[PDB]
Amino acid sequence: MVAFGVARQGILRQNEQRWRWIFRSVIYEPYLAMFGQVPSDVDST
Amino acid sequence: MVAFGVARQGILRQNEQRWRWIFRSVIYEPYLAMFGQVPSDVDST
């Protein structure tokens, strides 16, 4: 899950240089996928 | 489930002194979690 989350982070945006947005963005992917309405669907398009 | 519901009630707000809002708030957590779009995601943030 962490592997795929970091891969999603890389796909979404190339780089990020802040220790707050990155952690929240990474942690969002698990709950997003599990709760059903994952932004991942929006991210793909 | 009841244990985690009361824990969520405590986390959400410290105290509540009405025998109506408390019961509805407690009962909301199970259905919220099960039906997929649980306010718990909003509660965390």
Side-chain angles (χ1 to χ4, degrees), chain A residues 35-36, chain B residues 36:
Chain A
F35 98 98

Short mmCIF file of all heavy atoms in Angstrom, two decimals, chain A residues 35-36, chain B residues 36-37, unseen atoms left out:
data_model
loop_
_atom_site.label_atom_id
_atom_site.label_comp_id
_atom_site.label_asym_id
_atom_site.label_seq_id
_atom_site.Cartn_x
_atom_site.Cartn_y
_atom_site.Cartn_z
N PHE A 35 -12.56 3.74 1.18
CA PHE A 35 -13.90 4.26 1.43
C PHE A 35 -14.76 4.33 0.18
O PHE A 35 -15.95 4.64 0.28
CB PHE A 35 -13.81 5.64 2.11
CG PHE A 35 -13.97 6.80 1.17
CD1 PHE A 35 -15.19 7.44 1.03
CD2 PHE A 35 -12.88 7.27 0.44
CE1 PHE A 35 -15.33 8.52 0.18
CE2 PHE A 35 -13.02 8.35 -0.41
CZ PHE A 35 -14.24 8.97 -0.55
N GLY A 36 -14.20 4.05 -1.00
CA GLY A 36 -15.00 3.84 -2.19
C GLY A 36 -14.99 4.97 -3.19
O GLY A 36 -14.92 4.72 -4.40
N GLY B 36 -20.17 3.39 3.54
CA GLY B 36 -19.05 3.73 2.69
C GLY B 36 -18.60 5.18 2.75
O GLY B 36 -17.39 5.46 2.75
N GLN B 37 -19.54 6.12 2.79
CA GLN B 37 -19.21 7.54 2.88
C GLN B 37 -19.29 8.03 4.32
O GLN B 37 -20.01 8.97 4.65
CB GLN B 37 -20.12 8.35 1.97
#
